[PDB]
Amino acid sequence: MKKRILRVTFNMPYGPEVIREDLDVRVRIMKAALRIQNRATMEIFGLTTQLRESLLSQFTAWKHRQRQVGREDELMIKVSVEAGYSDQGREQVSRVFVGEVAIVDIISPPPDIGIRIQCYTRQIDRTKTIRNMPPANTTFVKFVEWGANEMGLNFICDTSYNDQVLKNPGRSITVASAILASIQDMYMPDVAAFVDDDILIVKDRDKVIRPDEVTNVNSFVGIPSWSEWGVEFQCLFEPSIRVAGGVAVESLMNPSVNGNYVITALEYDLASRDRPFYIKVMGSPAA
Amino acid sequence: MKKRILRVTFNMPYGPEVIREDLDVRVRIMKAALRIQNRATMEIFGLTTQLRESLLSQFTAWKHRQRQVGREDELMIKVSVEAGYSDQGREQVSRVFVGEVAIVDIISPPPDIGIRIQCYTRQIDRTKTIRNMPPANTTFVKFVEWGANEMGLNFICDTSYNDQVLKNPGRSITVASAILASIQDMYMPDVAAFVDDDILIVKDRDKVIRPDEVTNVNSFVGIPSWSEWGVEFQCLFEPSIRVAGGVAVESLMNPSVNGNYVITALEYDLASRDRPFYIKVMGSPAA
Amino acid sequence: LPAYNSDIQQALKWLHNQAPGITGLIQRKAQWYDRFSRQFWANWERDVFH
Amino acid sequence: MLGIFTSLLSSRSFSIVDQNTNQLVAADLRISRVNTRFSSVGQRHMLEDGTTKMDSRTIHPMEIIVEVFCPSIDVVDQINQLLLDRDTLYKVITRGMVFERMMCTSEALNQTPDMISATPARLTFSQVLVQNPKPIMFRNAGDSSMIDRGLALAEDVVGSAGDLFDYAVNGV
Amino acid sequence: STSTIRTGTNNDILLDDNGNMVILRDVEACAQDVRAAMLMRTGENIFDVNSGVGYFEYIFSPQKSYDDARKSIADAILSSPDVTGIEQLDIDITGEVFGVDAKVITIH
Amino acid sequence: STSTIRTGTNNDILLDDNGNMVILRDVEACAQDVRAAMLMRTGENIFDVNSGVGYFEYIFSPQKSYDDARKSIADAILSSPDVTGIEQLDIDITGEVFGVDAKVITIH
Amino acid sequence: KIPLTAVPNQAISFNAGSSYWKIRLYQNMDMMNADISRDGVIVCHGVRCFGGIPLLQYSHQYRPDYGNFVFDRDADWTLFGDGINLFYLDGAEFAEYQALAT
Amino acid sequence: KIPLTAVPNQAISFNAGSSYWKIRLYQNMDMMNADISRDGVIVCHGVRCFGGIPLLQYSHQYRPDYGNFVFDRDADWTLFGDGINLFYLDGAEFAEYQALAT
Amino acid sequence: MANYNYIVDTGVIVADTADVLSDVEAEFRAALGANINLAASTPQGSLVAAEAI
Amino acid sequence: ARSSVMRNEARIANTINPNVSFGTFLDAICALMGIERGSDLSTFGYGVQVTG
């Protein structure tokens, strides 16, 4: 009888504070191939007075220590979410989200005090500015490389538009967050630019980033069906599923929709004491 | 055993019509420090044929007698709301909202016919125009004073920006409603301009309008908690709570959040035959 | 205000009553640390006495 | 229930222990029933072929229901105080079973023509569920870990700079 | 799964003829570990108080129920890294001696 | 967690041979406090009305039931800073006296 | 004054005197000790706990224009909140304190 | 290092040294064997796994500027995570170690 | 091995007992075997406690 | 390893000569001498200013 594993970490100034799966934790994660940054909402129950003091007071959203020695962590803290299974003491955990806390609330009154939290990926850029002048006359790939260096992310680019010359590409970007909107704007809708975890990915719509890591899928909780854009189904927590990766589909109810699909959007509904522990996938035909 | 009082007053042409607490009346009020006007949704049950004919027919939203001798009451009627408690025959009623009816509906079918109403504060200005030319070169405070005289409201202004010269402040304002948007636009977000009841209030974000009327709060239905802007809690109907006023907070479960806060937004949920009789408060640190 | 013991011998316990080996091992460790961590500072303080 | 073989004659069946002070409370309680209930819910997912899979199981607090008789008035006050208590946890020793971290939820008295001298009563306890049921303690206060109390607001009580000096060094 | 160093009838390190400390593999290490764990006495583990068998307030002292001693002994038998559950306890109490019997179930 | 100034069998400040007004620590401070509380009478405490024992309305007056005296005395024993609960109240009324006995439980 | 509590090891942070401080108090054998942080940068490690002796000793620390901290009496974590306090004095107040001290 | 587990045939993929890696470890008869892929394209196949000597033997594979992997001992799938480890070395460290190997 | 440089330019840094104990346990695990029994009962547990103290 | 490390740390903490010390040397200075130079910034007074 395999048990589920769900940890949430906070990079507090003194160190990490990890909330294990033993408490009541509910998380919903939404990921897509777009410029709009990913979101994760957390439900946390049973926090005591000491831990409420430790955590809830650091999501201030005001600014302090104005001298600003450094950046990144001296504004808002980072949260990392990893989920998986555990069988016979053998673990198969995997990471699914990285972000920073943005919005705080209180949901349930006593005798069980629970809080709700909103986290977004790469929200540190909405405050950081641009200090390196963008290239004036260059090709697409060099613009992408400059953006990756400016944000501070490992990047991958593979498009048919790699040898196209742009004039004045980014001379009107105020902060570091509109770089992604710039990159996506030029060649919509075929070129899709998005930031996943810590990687900037720019690619054509129907290309699998890793052709040799196709995950064969044959066990469905949500019956596959035609989705007006491709296919859409649902499964249990599979650590292998990613964004822009490929899937090979074999069905029993609906054998007519078997084929290769490229993943467009994802969903996560992970709970430690409730029924939902799921992943929802929408795909497009693989070119 | 104190009883609750909830009175809704309507100003018909012949006189006032008061719906008392004896009937089934539900009201939700939302107030904030913004240019967007306040709102109130009203649920009224048990209205007979005579009262239905008397009231529902005056919510016309068309125009009658285009000649328009005068203004204000010859377009839309005004509704005033006062709620409180009664103990041993001794009352503590207080007014909480003033507005005009905008939208009409019908909610429940027979045997019990119930209606829903939408009211907004200072909606009379969306029809009235401007006939006094704004000053050309002038300070902020004189622009605010001209706006107050034009709308017809008693005003209070207390800002650090009181001695700044503006050029052509309001030369592109069509009707009387955009005056408030003009006033808020210039020095956003530090300067907050809002209209409460019938008073125009312009002030800095973190200044208490009445320094000597701080209400000490020590009994909360909703446990106080941090809300990434200040504090947020909930209580029974306390007439002392207002917008931009201050509160002194003393807690039991959460004594780490004690302090002085300035009130930002409020919500009212008052019913005469249901459980909700509440007030929700969001606060910001006092400066 | 609360006491602080910091002795190596609280590791020893009442199982090791007829055990010569482990008791000797812990005792020798304790006296080595005494010699080279406490008498050191005592002699050092005495030589800082001007 | 087998297990222990005492050879002690006058033993004790049921007792509520004050886990803070190791003290008995309401020791004079004749007992009519004792019921113990466990509960858990297993989350099942409905597959594609036609089967059905379960991934994990969740455990809720147990509940203990006891029916008692109060032969006096002092017992009734003791029961009411047991219910109203809010800060302590109680350990319950049944016929052969010992449970911990229990805390009373309700009481229900009766006043009927069947019983005049004594009042029949029913009580209910519920376990406070806490992870890591076996704590780890240090004998030395100097070995304790670090607590945060992060980001308090700070307070300013009126007092001159010279006052602190004349109270701290001078003594006054 | 676990391992430990052999100890003699006294709680002392026992060295083989060649003089090598022998690291016991499973099963046997479980036996020695449970035997030792039953002999702690409470309040004697520095850095973890509230572990052991409460001899001087649950067994030797004049009690009322003797159930607390049984639960304490059952706890001490458990908490070993390999023990799964306990099949039997006896608690004889015949005369002046206090007999305790057990048969433990282990994974390996 | 409490303290008080010692008094004699008549409620005055009692001074030692050194004349020192002594701050009694817990337990006997609780005994002195409860003795003073049960003797305070209702309608004597200004700024706190309805506090005290109703001797002239519940005990000395002709009364039917005599549970009111028990409730009032139990309440006056309560409201002390340290009392947790009341173990026994008897109310004998044997002879011409009105015999009252009580045993209280404190945190210590 | 600074809000404290009776725990042998704690570390509270606050925004006082136009700067952001983080202080740490822990019992070490006989006396207390303290760690002081400013702006996320460590300042001192293991400065002791004495009544009337200011915590910050050196000019590159206590101010060009900042403040300083002082205990009224030799602190112990059993009495925190009851007779033992920690006070913060801004630049002018601390300067006059030092002037009057000698 | 490489977080590994005790399985007779397994695979690992990660981002190391500003590049993507994919290592497939499997038992073959007696010795351990591995297959190395970088950035989706194969590098070498069926490399016998041994202690100390690196997995990449050839210059055009391990680096113009990339790194390499080294086992401390002969691998054994029943010991992984327990006294046996795999380490990744960047360009500079591995160049130093290779020079030391002579 | 697991030594810490706790004497720096700003002063001396003292660690909490949990961290020291975990470091000592890791050191003994590396010494003997990754599955050893380190509890109050076993002799190696007493050695670990002595070292930590 | 452990005994070597504790002896080394004792020898590091022991030697506190002014020509050997570092950082804690500020205390050896404050034993007799005035403490280090506080960082300071030079202000301007009476800078002219003309406008409407």
Side-chain angles (χ1 to χ4, degrees):
Chain A
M1 185 145 186
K2 64 183 180 180
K3 42 191 293 292
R4 50 174 70 158
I5 282 295
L6 171 79
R7 280 84 65 91
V8 161
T9 316
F10 289 113
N11 282 12
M12 302 273 172
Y14 61 92
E17 168 76 70
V18 185
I19 297 89
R20 301 265 162 217
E21 61 274 347
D22 302 340
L23 294 100
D24 204 76
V25 167
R26 186 167 159 105
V27 165
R28 275 92 56 77
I29 311 181
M30 291 198 176
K31 281 191 269 288
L34 279 177
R35 69 178 197 78
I36 61 171
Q37 55 190 356
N38 312 333
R39 199 212 57 215
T41 69
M42 294 183 286
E43 184 71 27
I44 298 187
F45 266 96
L47 294 183
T48 44
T49 53
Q50 262 309 301
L51 200 61
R52 256 190 279 141
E53 265 182 348
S54 178
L55 273 69
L56 279 187
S57 42
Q58 310 294 83
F59 315 146
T60 314
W62 296 99
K63 211 177 178 195
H64 56 266
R65 66 184 184 273
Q66 282 165 246
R67 261 80 61 79
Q68 282 318 125
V69 194
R71 198 63 76 180
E72 212 286 329
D73 49 351
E74 292 85 4
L75 296 196
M76 64 184 73
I77 65 167
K78 205 188 89 160
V79 61
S80 171
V81 170
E82 58 259 27
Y85 277 118
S86 277
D87 189 358
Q88 212 52 41
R90 212 194 268 102
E91 284 190 4
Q92 202 170 3
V93 192
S94 310
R95 222 168 72 175
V96 296
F97 178 83
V98 169
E100 299 97 25
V101 183
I103 285 182
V104 181
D105 200 325
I106 174 161
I107 287 304
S108 188
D112 51 355
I113 305 105
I115 71 151
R116 189 175 57 189
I117 289 294
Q118 307 263 322
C119 314
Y120 295 86
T121 197
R122 289 305 300 207
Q123 204 189 11
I124 202 56
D125 279 359
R126 298 176 75 79
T127 305
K128 206 163 66 63
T129 182
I130 289 152
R131 81 194 162 287
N132 311 328
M133 271 285 258
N137 174 17
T138 186
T139 43
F140 196 88
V141 64
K142 305 307 299 188
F143 191 40
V144 169
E145 186 151 23
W146 162 81
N149 290 318
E150 203 55 37
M151 283 193 308
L153 302 178
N154 271 326
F155 83 115
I156 188 168
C157 182
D158 201 355
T159 61
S160 44
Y161 292 165
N162 275 26
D163 271 0
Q164 259 179 339
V165 175
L166 305 165
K167 167 182 171 289
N168 280 341
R171 285 304 216 275
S172 286
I173 315 157
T174 62
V175 288
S177 61
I179 302 159
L180 197 64
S182 304
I183 292 177
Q184 190 186 10
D185 197 85
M186 271 85 78
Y187 290 118
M188 261 195 278
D190 301 66
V191 161
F194 64 99
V195 166
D196 210 329
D197 275 346
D198 262 348
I199 303 107
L200 168 73
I201 286 158
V202 176
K203 65 164 204 68
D204 189 358
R205 266 196 289 100
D206 285 9
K207 271 199 215 163
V208 170
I209 55 158
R210 309 282 159 72
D212 50 9
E213 271 200 289
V214 191
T215 67
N216 170 30
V217 189
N218 52 45
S219 56
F220 298 144
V221 166
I223 174 172
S225 185
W226 302 263
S227 71
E228 189 276 331
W229 274 121
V231 75
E232 163 203 355
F233 60 90
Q234 178 170 48
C235 285
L236 276 176
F237 183 80
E238 275 155 317
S240 300
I241 281 183
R242 296 291 90 192
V243 193
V247 292
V249 165
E250 293 82 3
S251 161
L252 280 76
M253 301 265 188
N254 273 332
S256 159
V257 66
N258 284 8
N260 296 313
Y261 295 90
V262 55
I263 285 170
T264 284
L266 285 189
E267 276 276 24
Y268 290 78
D269 211 344
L270 317 172
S272 61
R273 283 168 82 81
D274 313 317
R275 158 190 306 284
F277 210 75
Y278 290 121
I279 277 168
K280 179 170 267 288
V281 182
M282 293 182 286
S284 304
Chain B
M1 183 165 202
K2 49 185 184 182
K3 46 190 302 297
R4 50 171 71 159
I5 296 294
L6 174 80
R7 297 197 266 261
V8 161
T9 316
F10 277 121
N11 282 5
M12 291 325 98
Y14 75 96
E17 166 73 76
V18 189
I19 297 89
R20 304 221 170 271
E21 61 266 348
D22 297 334
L23 281 73
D24 200 75
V25 174
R26 188 166 156 107
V27 159
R28 268 96 55 76
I29 315 179
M30 291 215 188
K31 286 194 274 326
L34 274 180
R35 67 181 180 86
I36 59 171
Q37 45 194 354
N38 316 322
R39 201 212 62 221
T41 69
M42 308 214 177
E43 187 86 29
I44 297 187
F45 269 94
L47 285 194
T48 42
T49 46
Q50 262 307 304
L51 211 46
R52 267 184 286 164
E53 170 68 6
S54 166
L55 274 70
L56 279 190
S57 59
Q58 310 297 85
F59 295 163
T60 301
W62 304 89
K63 214 176 185 187
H64 41 60
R65 195 48 172 255
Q66 300 137 26
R67 299 179 188 178
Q68 293 307 309
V69 170
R71 191 63 71 189
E72 190 276 331
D73 56 344
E74 290 89 6
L75 296 190
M76 311 175 278
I77 64 168
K78 199 160 64 193
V79 54
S80 171
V81 176
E82 58 262 25
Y85 277 120
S86 290
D87 168 72
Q88 214 53 41
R90 202 193 279 103
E91 286 188 4
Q92 290 184 181
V93 182
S94 302
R95 186 179 68 188
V96 286
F97 178 83
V98 171
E100 300 96 26
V101 178
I103 285 175
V104 182
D105 201 326
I106 179 164
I107 291 308
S108 192
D112 51 356
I113 303 104
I115 75 160
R116 191 172 53 183
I117 293 299
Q118 305 265 324
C119 316
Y120 292 90
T121 191
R122 290 303 301 199
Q123 201 188 10
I124 201 59
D125 280 358
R126 297 174 76 79
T127 314
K128 198 171 75 67
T129 175
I130 292 159
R131 79 196 162 288
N132 310 330
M133 281 285 89
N137 315 122
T138 182
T139 42
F140 188 79
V141 54
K142 305 304 303 153
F143 188 44
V144 171
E145 178 150 27
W146 161 81
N149 290 318
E150 201 54 37
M151 275 188 318
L153 306 176
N154 276 325
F155 81 114
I156 171 170
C157 167
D158 201 356
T159 48
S160 43
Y161 293 100
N162 274 24
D163 273 0
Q164 261 179 334
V165 169
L166 312 163
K167 166 182 170 290
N168 292 6
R171 285 308 221 275
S172 290
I173 308 182
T174 63
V175 295
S177 60
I179 299 161
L180 190 61
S182 310
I183 294 177
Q184 191 188 9
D185 199 74
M186 271 86 68
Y187 296 112
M188 181 155 57
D190 293 72
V191 171
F194 65 98
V195 169
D196 208 324
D197 273 28
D198 70 326
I199 298 105
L200 178 64
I201 289 151
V202 176
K203 62 167 208 67
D204 207 57
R205 272 193 289 102
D206 286 7
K207 269 198 210 151
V208 171
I209 53 160
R210 308 287 157 75
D212 44 22
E213 275 200 301
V214 193
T215 79
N216 173 219
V217 190
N218 51 43
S219 57
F220 320 89
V221 168
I223 182 170
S225 186
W226 308 262
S227 79
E228 57 91 22
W229 275 125
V231 65
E232 170 203 354
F233 61 87
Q234 182 172 46
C235 282
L236 279 167
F237 183 80
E238 277 158 314
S240 301
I241 286 177
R242 284 309 155 217
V243 185
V247 290
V249 167
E250 280 78 72
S251 158
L252 283 84
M253 311 205 188
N254 272 334
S256 158
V257 74
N258 282 9
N260 309 345
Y261 298 83
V262 64
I263 282 168
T264 294
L266 299 182
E267 289 135 30
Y268 290 66
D269 210 343
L270 320 171
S272 62
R273 283 168 81 83
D274 314 307
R275 162 193 310 281
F277 210 75
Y278 287 121
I279 275 167
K280 181 170 263 280
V281 182
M282 286 144 95
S284 307
Chain C
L1 278 179
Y4 198 82
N5 54 354
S6 81
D7 195 317
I8 320 306
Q9 286 198 355
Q10 285 88 18
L12 265 177
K13 64 182 73 174
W14 298 104
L15 296 175
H16 320 100
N17 210 3
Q18 309 281 36
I22 182 166
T23 54
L25 196 61
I26 298 309
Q27 289 217 90
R28 295 180 212 287
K29 187 194 299 275
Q31 62 207 1
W32 194 105
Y33 290 165
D34 274 28
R35 180 73 182 91
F36 286 95
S37 66
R38 265 288 325 280
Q39 306 160 227
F40 181 87
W41 288 99
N43 305 343
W44 193 85
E45 182 65 26
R46 186 170 45 76
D47 292 18
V48 170
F49 292 166
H50 198 192
Chain D
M1 293 177 70
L2 294 191
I4 321 174
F5 172 69
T6 66
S7 306
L8 192 142
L9 210 75
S10 67
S11 278
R12 195 167 171 78
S13 168
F14 179 89
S15 63
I16 295 156
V17 177
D18 202 348
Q19 220 178 2
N20 277 133
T21 76
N22 281 339
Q23 206 57 45
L24 276 297
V25 296
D28 214 15
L29 267 172
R30 329 307 188 199
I31 303 185
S32 159
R33 313 280 281 181
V34 161
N35 210 304
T36 299
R37 191 147 295 99
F38 293 75
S39 280
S40 87
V41 161
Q43 317 295 343
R44 71 201 74 201
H45 308 297
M46 182 95 97
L47 288 201
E48 200 265 2
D49 48 28
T51 67
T52 297
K53 197 151 275 191
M54 261 165 58
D55 47 4
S56 185
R57 218 173 84 233
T58 317
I59 294 91
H60 307 292
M62 65 183 73
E63 311 216 20
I64 292 177
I65 319 166
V66 64
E67 323 195 319
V68 296
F69 282 84
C70 319
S72 61
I73 175 58
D74 308 329
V75 185
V76 182
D77 293 8
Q78 286 263 63
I79 293 298
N80 294 14
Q81 275 143 43
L82 197 81
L83 178 64
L84 278 187
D85 205 345
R86 282 181 76 222
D87 47 1
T88 197
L89 284 199
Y90 291 125
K91 172 179 78 178
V92 167
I93 298 175
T94 314
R95 201 180 280 165
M97 323 161 185
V98 188
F99 307 93
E100 295 180 353
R101 295 132 46 198
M102 310 282 326
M103 182 179 72
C104 197
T105 73
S106 85
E107 88 189 7
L109 297 156
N110 262 317
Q111 316 211 314
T112 47
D114 199 351
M115 293 270 316
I116 285 188
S117 84
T119 56
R122 267 185 72 260
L123 290 145
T124 308
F125 302 84
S126 165
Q127 207 179 40
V128 160
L129 199 60
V130 164
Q131 85 191 45
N132 206 320
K134 292 283 179 290
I136 309 193
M137 313 307 213
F138 295 163
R139 199 164 272 165
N140 287 318
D143 291 331
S144 43
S145 278
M146 181 215 308
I147 71 172
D148 291 331
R149 314 181 30 71
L151 198 41
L153 272 186
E155 71 166 80
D156 285 329
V157 181
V158 62
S160 172
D163 299 336
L164 198 154
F165 179 83
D166 63 50
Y167 172 53
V169 169
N170 297 149
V172 67
Chain E
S1 86
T2 50
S3 60
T4 190
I5 307 171
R6 207 214 295 132
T7 178
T9 179
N10 44 62
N11 300 304
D12 185 20
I13 301 187
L14 183 62
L15 279 71
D16 65 340
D17 57 357
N18 196 5
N20 280 35
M21 293 180 183
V22 297
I23 295 295
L24 266 69
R25 275 290 94 73
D26 63 358
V27 185
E28 307 98 17
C30 283
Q32 293 180 356
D33 291 331
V34 174
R35 193 186 170 268
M38 281 216 287
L39 294 153
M40 294 298 102
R41 165 166 94 99
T42 188
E44 188 172 0
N45 187 344
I46 295 299
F47 309 125
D48 194 329
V49 177
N50 290 318
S51 294
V53 177
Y55 287 122
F56 282 73
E57 57 273 20
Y58 283 49
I59 296 90
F60 287 131
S61 175
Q63 304 296 335
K64 301 268 207 63
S65 297
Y66 284 103
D67 203 323
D68 296 65
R70 184 213 174 68
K71 182 65 173 67
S72 191
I73 295 172
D75 282 7
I77 285 171
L78 306 179
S79 78
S80 172
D82 307 280
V83 294
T84 58
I86 178 64
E87 182 158 62
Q88 315 271 50
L89 282 72
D90 287 359
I91 316 287
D92 212 15
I93 307 175
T94 57
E96 193 47 287
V97 304
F98 187 97
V100 168
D101 302 305
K103 303 142 92 182
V104 190
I105 298 95
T106 59
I107 284 173
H108 37 72
Chain F
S1 287
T2 179
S3 60
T4 188
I5 313 187
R6 180 145 48 77
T7 196
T9 187
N10 56 353
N11 303 297
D12 292 23
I13 295 188
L14 199 151
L15 311 98
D16 196 45
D17 71 26
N18 200 0
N20 269 37
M21 291 165 38
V22 299
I23 289 311
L24 270 187
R25 304 312 320 287
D26 57 348
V27 182
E28 68 274 15
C30 289
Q32 182 177 0
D33 271 317
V34 300
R35 198 189 160 270
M38 303 166 56
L39 278 153
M40 202 265 298
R41 186 166 94 107
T42 297
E44 269 207 329
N45 186 319
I46 299 169
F47 311 118
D48 263 9
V49 184
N50 287 317
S51 294
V53 178
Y55 286 118
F56 281 70
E57 290 89 6
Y58 284 22
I59 297 89
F60 290 149
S61 176
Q63 216 68 13
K64 296 270 199 176
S65 63
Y66 275 9
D67 46 41
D68 292 337
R70 210 198 79 92
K71 172 58 53 62
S72 185
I73 294 169
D75 214 348
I77 281 166
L78 274 163
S79 78
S80 177
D82 210 2
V83 180
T84 300
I86 298 169
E87 165 165 338
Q88 184 174 1
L89 283 172
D90 272 0
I91 311 296
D92 200 16
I93 190 167
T94 48
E96 198 50 282
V97 304
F98 184 91
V100 176
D101 281 3
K103 301 147 51 62
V104 310
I105 301 101
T106 70
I107 60 176
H108 40 69
Chain G
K1 64 179 71 174
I2 307 305
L4 291 194
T5 194
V7 167
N9 192 358
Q10 62 192 298
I12 192 163
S13 45
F14 53 95
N15 218 15
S18 76
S19 189
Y20 177 91
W21 304 89
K22 186 163 88 65
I23 303 171
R24 183 176 181 269
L25 281 173
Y26 62 94
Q27 178 179 0
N28 189 5
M29 293 211 320
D30 309 314
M31 296 88 95
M32 281 275 198
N33 273 340
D35 290 336
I36 310 168
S37 296
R38 183 136 58 71
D39 283 294
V41 176
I42 199 65
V43 173
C44 67
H45 273 155
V47 295
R48 292 176 183 84
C49 177
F50 283 140
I53 318 294
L55 300 194
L56 279 80
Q57 297 297 76
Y58 293 151
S59 296
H60 49 283
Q61 310 178 3
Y62 56 78
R63 87 291 183 276
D65 51 347
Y66 319 137
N68 209 337
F69 297 121
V70 65
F71 279 147
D72 51 344
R73 270 170 282 165
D74 290 14
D76 56 32
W77 60 262
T78 313
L79 272 297
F80 280 173
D82 279 28
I84 299 294
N85 283 319
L86 178 61
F87 292 111
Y88 170 61
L89 319 174
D90 52 0
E93 293 217 288
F94 178 59
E96 72 181 1
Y97 182 89
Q98 270 186 347
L100 200 151
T102 297
Chain H
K1 67 184 289 184
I2 307 299
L4 294 174
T5 187
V7 163
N9 188 357
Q10 57 185 312
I12 299 283
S13 69
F14 48 94
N15 60 276
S18 75
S19 294
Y20 204 74
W21 299 82
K22 181 178 182 291
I23 302 173
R24 183 174 100 78
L25 271 155
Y26 61 89
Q27 164 169 8
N28 183 13
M29 312 272 258
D30 189 358
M31 272 85 67
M32 289 277 100
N33 274 341
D35 285 347
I36 300 308
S37 299
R38 180 156 77 260
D39 300 350
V41 295
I42 198 65
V43 180
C44 180
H45 274 151
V47 183
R48 265 195 285 291
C49 169
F50 273 134
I53 60 175
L55 288 190
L56 285 175
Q57 285 312 84
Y58 304 158
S59 66
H60 62 102
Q61 293 158 0
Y62 71 112
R63 65 179 177 88
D65 303 87
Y66 321 128
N68 215 347
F69 297 103
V70 164
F71 281 92
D72 62 357
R73 272 175 162 76
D74 293 28
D76 174 327
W77 75 267
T78 70
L79 264 171
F80 276 79
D82 295 330
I84 188 75
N85 274 7
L86 176 63
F87 295 94
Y88 166 69
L89 317 173
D90 56 48
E93 297 177 358
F94 181 67
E96 191 210 357
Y97 170 82
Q98 178 209 332
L100 271 68
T102 71
Chain I
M1 220 195 297
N3 169 37
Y4 274 65
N5 190 300
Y6 53 91
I7 309 169
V8 294
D9 293 326
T10 48
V12 59
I13 307 161
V14 294
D16 303 288
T17 311
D19 291 331
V20 178
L21 186 68
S22 43
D23 278 20
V24 177
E25 261 176 0
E27 292 181 13
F28 274 58
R29 211 74 51 79
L32 288 146
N35 62 302
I36 194 72
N37 191 322
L38 310 165
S41 57
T42 58
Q44 59 264 12
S46 87
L47 296 164
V48 169
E51 170 82 333
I53 291 171
Chain J
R2 44 171 191 141
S3 308
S4 306
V5 175
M6 282 74 75
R7 200 56 183 87
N8 266 337
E9 281 163 5
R11 69 178 178 87
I12 285 186
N14 170 31
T15 182
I16 59 167
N17 290 316
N19 314 327
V20 185
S21 53
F22 64 112
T24 65
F25 172 71
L26 295 171
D27 279 0
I29 282 300
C30 200
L32 303 104
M33 174 174 329
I35 62 171
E36 283 194 1
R37 283 81 63 194
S39 298
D40 206 309
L41 295 83
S42 85
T43 76
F44 281 175
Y46 295 90
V48 73
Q49 172 51 264
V50 59
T51 186

